[PDB]
Amino acid sequence: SVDAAEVTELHVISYEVERDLTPLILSNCQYQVEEGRETVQEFDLEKIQRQIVSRFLQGKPRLSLKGIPTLVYRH
Secondary structure, X not given: OOOOOOXXXXXXXXXXHHHHHHXXXXXXXXXXXXXXXXXXXXXXXXXXXXXXXXXXXXXOOOOOOOOOOOOOOOO
16 A cells, blocks of 8 residues: 555556557557458457556555644633
């Protein structure tokens, strides 16, 4: 575990749709052809999950803040 005081870019799940995800999908997107039949796509779902897991997923933060009643002096 981690606490929300130490949180840095390395703990959070940081990804960009265009730079990271779309290339991944397009690279996993694969094609098949046969005689007298049209081309057909077939995404390698399992490889996509394996890559997303390997790249973006680790860590966990918890909490941070002080409090309201900071001073309740005598009265």
